[PDB]
Amino acid sequence: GPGGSPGGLQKRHARVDVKYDRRELQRRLDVEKWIDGRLEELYRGREADMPDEVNIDELLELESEEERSRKIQGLLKSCTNPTENFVQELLVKLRGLHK
């Protein structure tokens, strides 16, 4: 089709709206809200281009949990604060998601 103003196809990589499948179990929907609240507080005056990703299931997609914590640190390694509170509040709030 005609070009001119490219938009709609991938707007950016450091910004995403839907990260998980918040549906059926309202618990997942609480995780998304927690991310908006925690992520908005994890930086507050610091973009750092954000992490290349956020959903560990996209890079890990495994069953072990000890590896999930390493993927979260390497993911937010570019950010400022560590993800120790995110790895805990996220693993304690969900602790499942596609077993």
Curated annotation (Swiss-Prot):
Family that this chain belongs to: Belongs to the PP1 inhibitor family.
Impact reported for residue 23 to A: Reduces inhibitory activity
Record's keyword terms, sorted: Cytoplasm, Phosphoprotein, Protein phosphatase inhibitor
One GO cellular component term: cytoplasm
Main location: cytoplasm
Region of the whole protein represented: 22 to 120 of 147
Stretches for region Inhibitory: 14-99
Full protein name: Protein phosphatase 1 regulatory subunit 14A
Domain of life, per lineage: Eukaryota
Residues carrying Phosphothreonine: 17
Keyword Cytoplasm (UniProt): yes
Tissue-level expression: Detected in aorta smooth muscle and bladder.
Sites bearing Phosphoserine, chain numbering: 5
Molecular-function annotations in GO: protein serine/threonine phosphatase inhibitor activity
Cell compartment(s), UniProt: Cytoplasm
Organism classification: Eukaryota, Metazoa, Chordata, Craniata, Vertebrata
Role of this protein: Inhibitor of PPP1CA. Has over 1000-fold higher inhibitory activity when phosphorylated, creating a molecular switch for regulating the phosphorylation status of PPP1CA substrates and smooth muscle contraction.
